[PDB]
Design a protein around this ligand. Structure first.
Ligand SMILES: [Mg+2]
Ligand SMILES: [Mg+2]
Lengths: 48, 113, 49, 227, 231
């Protein structure tokens, strides 16, 4: 089976920041740079 | 949204007539939210410059970029002249609409913090 | 940025508003041009979004 | 892949001329805020209305002064004049000057203003000021057509030397609130439901305001036609 | 003091890129017009994508082909980047055929030409074929809108065919600039510039036009009010 990332799957970085994907927004709902480039992932600063 | 601005530009200057305060603010000598003294009372330029007849007008002014939510200002709410931010008025209205009682909601909140 | 300046585009209104907000936050030095301030923010790793 | 759209149904719920609720469902994913945001922006800024732009009061130099014989200060009176809802019946009319002369132990209302051709006061029971014995109030107020919100020191208009510029609230719309909730049609999961809430002063109805709001937007879309 | 119809400027580079200016516009209308268009341009603009792949002697996606460097998964990944333009509006589907062999690097150019169908990126790499390496493919490309994963559409032309994730949107990127402008004695007005990048399937101007059409049609939905029976 080929498994695409879905809501409830678990992500982490090398620094101990871990979390479960709670939402997947369409590209037009994503925060973007002035040149139109949208961000991939939004991490809450409260976790730092 | 409920925090207020504290600015160092004015730095507690003394003014006689409020129009001198407005003029000084226009020259860039005194910041909007910087504490100053007009006459004997301590106040800020913002409380003078912008005086709203009701919350709706204040938030409408916020929508047009006239003032931010953290700017200390003057608003007429429930027959009272209040020196406060549009943000705290907004909070008050959030509570009031949530509980559907305006008087009680006014009594429950601490507005000045 | 320089790419943008070459493409014929100036600083955005919203970018200016954000620069005002950032100016109040002590992130940039008041009096500098929009580009200089955007560079200061970018050097802090922050961008307009 | 293969898609079939039923198309949306518009639902209206109104209380008087002051308030209304607008529900548009179902909508394709994302179109909830795509429609709702411009409409809100337009409804606040671009809707034509009237406002008091200037006030002159006899023997009153500036805004922070006080009025002998009257209990309210100038500041409070100006506020009361901001809440005046004035409607222009004739589309031609740009501006009106309303005069008010009263004295003695009386409470001045919006009814007291001398009637002008094709000018209707929606709120005649609005309180302006209270006068005591010997109290005298002579005032002229400037009422203009316009849109949005203009501070007093922006338009900066004076008919005479003692005329006080007033922050001009043109917008008949007091507030706009919209909320997009997820909804489902059959097995379609992510479809949008747009709920719109519009508060006006009664000079324009919420439904009229919205209809005017969409028309402005539609008209702007036609600007992409001829290069 | 009412603003009137603004000048609309158009700048194009090939079929890939475009800039669309509107000036002057009333304050705050740069965003009001610009943003919904970007939201519609990134989502609702119809286009073409490969919906299916069949390779001879390949039963599924998880298999490798003798003489070929890339596994089927990578091959399909490459085929997801294939940009196919339909000249005829009436045509909803096309099956491209690819027959290749011997040592060579098979690109998207190697597909057999079909009437009223143009490949916008003929240099796109598909596979690396070795001596005796042999590749026979049939790829189904459809018209569609948005993003439909393979699991949702499940399109199979034949038994051993593999459903492909389809990104239908022709629009690669959308940005908009709002700059300070003035007309006469008016100040703080808006100059709106829409920057549009597409894949060539449809031109940025076409995209802008059908986006505007979509928004207008949506505005039509307010034409028929209904009383609320909740009371
Ligand atoms: Mg003022
Ligand atoms: Mg209290």
């Amino acid at each position: 089976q080929k498994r695409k990332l879905q809501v409830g799957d678990k992500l982490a970085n090398r620094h101990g920041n871990k979390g479960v994907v709670a939402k997947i927004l369409p590209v037009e709902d994503m925060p973007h740079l002035p040149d139109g480039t949208p961000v991939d992932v939004i991490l809450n600063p409260l976790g730092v | 949204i409920t925090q207020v601005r504290k600015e160092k530009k004015g730095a507690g200057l003394e003014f006689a007539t409020p129009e001198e305060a407005l003029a000084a603010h226009e020259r860039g000598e005194v910041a909007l939210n910087a504490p100053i003294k007009v006459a004997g009372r301590e106040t800020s330029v913002g409380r003078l410059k912008y005086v709203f007849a009701n919350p709706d007008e204040a938030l409408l002014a916020v929508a047009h970029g006239i003032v931010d939510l953290q700017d200390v200002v003057t608003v007429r709410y429930m027959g009272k002249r209040l020196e406060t931010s549009p943000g705290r008025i907004l909070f008050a209205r959030i509570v009031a609409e949530a509980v559907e009682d305006e008087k009680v909601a006014w009594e429950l909140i601490q507005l000045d913090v | 940025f320089g790419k943008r300046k070459g493409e014929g585009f100036g600083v955005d209104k919203r970018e200016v508003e954000v620069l005002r907000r950032a100016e109040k936050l002590g992130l940039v030095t008041p009096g500098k041009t929009p580009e200089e301030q955007l560079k200061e923010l970018f050097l802090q790793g922050k961008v307009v979004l | 892949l293969d898609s079939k759209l039923k198309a949306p149904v518009f639902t209206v719920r109104t209380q008087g001329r002051e308030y209304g609720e607008f529900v548009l469902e179902p909508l394709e994913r994302g179109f909830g805020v795509t429609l709702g945001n411009p409409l809100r922006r337009i409804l606040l800024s671009s809707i034509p209305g009237t406002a008091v732009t200037s006030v002159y009061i006899e023997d009153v130099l500036h805004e922070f002064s006080t009025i002998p014989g009257v209990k309210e200060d100038v500041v409070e009176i100006i506020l009361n004049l901001k809440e005046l809802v004035v409607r222009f019946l004739n589309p031609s009319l740009q501006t009106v000057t309303l005069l008010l002369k009263a004295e003695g132990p009386k409470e001045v209302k919006a009814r007291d203003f001398l009637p002008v051709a094709d000018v209707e006061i929606m709120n005649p029971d609005l309180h302006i000021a209270t006068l005591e014995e010997g109290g005298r109030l002579n005032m002229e107020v400037r009422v203009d057509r316009g849109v949005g919100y203009v501070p007093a020191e922006k338009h900066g208009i004076k008919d005479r030397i003692n005329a006080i510029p007033v922050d001009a609230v043109f917008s008949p719309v007091r507030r706009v609130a919209f909320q997009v909730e997820d909804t489902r049609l059959g097995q379609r999961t992510d479809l949008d439901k747009l709920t719109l809430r519009i508060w006006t002063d009664g000079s324009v109805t919420p439904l009229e305001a919205l209809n005017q709001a969409v028309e402005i937007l539609r008209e702007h879309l036609t600007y992409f036609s001829n290069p």
